[PDB]
Symmetry: C2
Subunit: 214 residues, 2 copies
């Protein structure tokens, strides 16, 4: 059970020069591991098969080194179709541990989320529930906060968030914490504010409404 530690946790790079990646082993694998291309929603694909040697139709730019503890994966000529979660994985020891995950993002600039809270529908009040949805939209990076305020009461646990993938078009993100409440706790209050703290935001943006306003 040799722990494989990938030294870049994630990476963001606007498409360009060498974007070399790293994975370390807990022991001496000695050039007996492989590199992988798990694309989002896809089957993984072999990049490097034994610490180098550029497996079977890999285009021009995906060398790597190692031998035998801390291994490298050189993304030299970035080619932005290659934005995928990458994986070192030892093989010549059982059981066969994978790496951690090497989500390669894009580094445009830090942008502000266009924050949009949404009341639950009256159809949801016909369902006897209430889910307040606070948008974040068209921003960078994912490093955000949502602090729900229920007549200005800092609440969580009733709220499930939702992270879009990074867009191919504008490299942005979109969040939605979903403050799912009962209808009874919904009727107890009106001021439903959503304190959103993001780096592109200068302030913790509190997007609010009143129960029955919109």
């Amino acid at each position: 059970e040799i722990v494989m530690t990938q030294s870049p946790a994630t990476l963001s790079l606007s498409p360009g020069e060498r974007a070399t990646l790293s994975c370390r082993a807990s022991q001496s694998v000695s050039s007996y591991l492989a590199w992988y291309q798990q694309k989002p929603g896809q089957a993984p694909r072999l990049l490097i098969y034994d610490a180098s040697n550029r497996a079977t139709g890999i285009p021009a730019r995906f060398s790597g080194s190692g031998s035998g503890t801390d291994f490298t994966l050189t993304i030299s000529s970035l080619e932005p179709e290659d934005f995928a979660v990458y994986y070192c994985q030892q093989h010549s020891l059982l059981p066969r541990t994978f790496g951690g995950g090497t989500k390669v993002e894009i580094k445009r600039t830090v942008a502000a989320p266009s924050v949009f809270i949404f009341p639950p529908s009256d159809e949801q009040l016909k369902s006897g529930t209430a889910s307040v949805v606070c948008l974040l939209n068209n921003f960078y990076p994912r490093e955000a906060k949502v602090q729900w305020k229920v007549d200005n009461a800092l609440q969580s646990g009733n709220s499930q968030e939702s992270v879009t993938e990074q867009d191919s078009k504008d490299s942005t993100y979109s969040l939605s914490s979903t403050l799912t409440l009962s209808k009874a706790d919904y009727e107890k209050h009106k001021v439903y504010a959503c304190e959103v703290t993001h780096q592109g935001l200068s302030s913790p943006v509190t997007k609010s409404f009143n129960r029955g306003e919109c």
Copy 2:
């Protein structure tokens, strides 16, 4: 202190024939009392000075009889300018008791109030109070009810009503119970219904809204 009891309390007559009125004494006044024409918002005017004899410019139609306990006042040729509160008043005994009041209305037909509840303003919520105003409008007669419902709670005492005079034009009426509440008791509820029961109404009409709807 001879009690003067006017036998018609009020009267309603679409303009026409003899509209004779009555007042009774507790003792024998013996033709020593007078008839009066307190118009709305006006000074009273003498109609008959001693049980008959048609005082000093009274037009053609305002005779009366008596002598000496139960006296009459004949409005024979109605002339609808004469719609005023009328008064017997003894004089030849001290103290000089008046009658009860003889509001002469018009008898068009029984009509239904056009009922319109009104939320308090948010400016009233800026004042820290709340007064819910439920209209009645363009009806006949004044015999109406208002039953306030605060998330359907039959309330009163927080409500002051307001009776228009009978119109010269369409002989109608208009009411407004004013459910004056605190802002705190206002915020406790939404369903602000106004059960209006009138004769022109076939049903007890409950005009409602929700706090924050309109």
